[PDB]
Amino acid sequence: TKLDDDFKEMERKVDVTSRAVMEIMTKTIEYLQPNPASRPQAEALLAEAMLKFGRELGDDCNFGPALGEVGEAMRELSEVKDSLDMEVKQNFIDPLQNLHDKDLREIQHHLKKLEGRRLDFGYKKKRQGKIPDEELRQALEKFDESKEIAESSMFNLLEMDIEQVSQLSALVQAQLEYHKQAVQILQQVTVRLEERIRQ
């Protein structure tokens, strides 16, 4: 008793969608935080070093003060990197985890029940004429009820896929905003170093 080719195609797209969703989530996290114990920013740890050594050196000449300026720039960068991790967790990671825990999970449960009903009907078909026809009819329409529940769940997830595009757009918007802010921070510290070099 073999499910149609259209049902198997939807089921395959649904399996790809689910695997994409988990691997993309994992890889976005590993991109945000390549350090496995982090999954303070690295830029903060650098900021602090530059700042402490700037202070230890004093305001006498030019290097100590430059370290204060660059140290502060790095601290700012870390503030905006911290906002990136938060906005990506909330708007990209969490929506995909929920997708996995709710919609993709219900589908898998639907496929499990369908697999059971399918085997039931398989069995009753072999008992054909030796069992009541009502008993065969029941296995048949129970199998059909399941097939329809599964197929409408898979179909809806596939037709609502523009929501996954909204999630991708959320990841990108957050990175865009982070990078734009980093440009402003660094443009400003650039001016202060160039001035300092020129005097």
Next chain:
Amino acid sequence: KLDDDFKEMERKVDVTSRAVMEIMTKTIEYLQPNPASRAKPQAEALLAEAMLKFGRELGDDCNFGPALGEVGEAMRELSEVKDSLDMEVKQNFIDPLQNLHDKDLREIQHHLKKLEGRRLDFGYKKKRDEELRQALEKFDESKEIAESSMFNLLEMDIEQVSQLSALVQAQLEYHKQAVQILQQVTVRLEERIRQA
């Protein structure tokens, strides 16, 4: 005995030395925060490739599949400008600072060690006079070699500022290129969302 100014220069050289090392190490760890990658595939490129793979495997042209290709290629683009940053920072910031450590700062520790040698030479002859003063003249000579070394490093300060400047320039170029990459793919995703 040493001028309070010689001792102050020595102090500042110590700090500069310790700053140079700590900051190199923290800059590297900021380019590559994963210790296992820090042996020598950036993280953006592994994301890019996952998105590209799943885009093509999905085999569905409604929305998600095409968008994965679009963002996949954006992520690979960011990967490339990140390569450039890592290379630029190593070349214009990390190497200049390792060179300052290996050459100038080493040279000053060598001079300061010779100077102590001279002190011990004199500090032993003090237990027993044209000689007890030929040694104090040798110390004095070593003092001025040491202090002209320290002086030159500290006075030429603006080179270190110039090195910080190269770290910033590399970061700024990187972030500017990341902005434009991300702007182009923002347009592709909005047109897609606009149809739906």
